[PDB]
Amino acid sequence: RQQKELIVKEMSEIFKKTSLILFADFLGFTVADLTELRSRLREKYGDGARFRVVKNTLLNLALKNAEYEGYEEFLKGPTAVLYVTEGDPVEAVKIIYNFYKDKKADLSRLKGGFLEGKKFTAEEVENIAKLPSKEELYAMLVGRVKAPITGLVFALSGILRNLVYVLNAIKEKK
C-alpha cells in the first residue's frame, strides 16, 4: 500500500521526541470508548498526546528506526500506542489507567513502554500512575532540600507554640 512508509516515517520521527510511549491492548473496546479516551487525553494535552491504533508491523518498524530496544514483548498481538510529545509525561499514564478502571478492564492490558526512555513493565504502570507530576516533583524537591532549614525554624517556634497550645487546652477544659 506504500502509504505505510508515510506512517513509518511519520511514526519514527514521533518516537524520537516522545517523553512517553505506552503499549495497550485495546481489543474489545468500542468506537465510543476510543473517542472517549482521546477526549480525556485532549482535555489535558491538546495536540500534545495521542492514542493511536497502528499495525504491529509498522509500529515495530517505527520503534526500530527510533533505536528502541526490548519492545518486542509489548507487541504480541494488535497493540495501540499512547504517547506524549509535549507536556508532563506521567499524567497521560494516570488518564489511561483510570480509564481502563472506569471500563472494568484488565489493567494487565496496559503492557508497558518507555518513560522518557526508561523501559517499564505492565506491573510498573501502577507505580507510574502513583508518581506526582514532574511539576509537583520539583516543588517536592525544593521542600526536601529546604527541610533542614524549615525544621530548624519550626523546632524553635514550636517551644512557644506549645505554650499557646497547652493554654488553649486549659481554657478548653473550662
Binding site: 517551644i159 505554650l163 497547652v166 493554654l167 486549659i170
Partner: peptide, 29 residues
C-alpha cells in the same frame, strides 16, 4: 495580672519556659 504574667514569661529563659510548659501539661492527662 495578665500583663504581669506576660512580662514574667518574657524574662524566663528557654529552659525555664520548657519547664513551665511541661508542668502545665502535667496538671491534666
Amino acid at each position: 495580672t495578665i500583663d504581669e504574667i506576660i512580662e514574667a514569661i518574657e524574662k524566663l529563659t528557654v529552659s525555664e519556659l520548657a519547664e513551665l510548659v511541661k508542668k502545665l501539661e502535667d496538671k491534666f492527662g
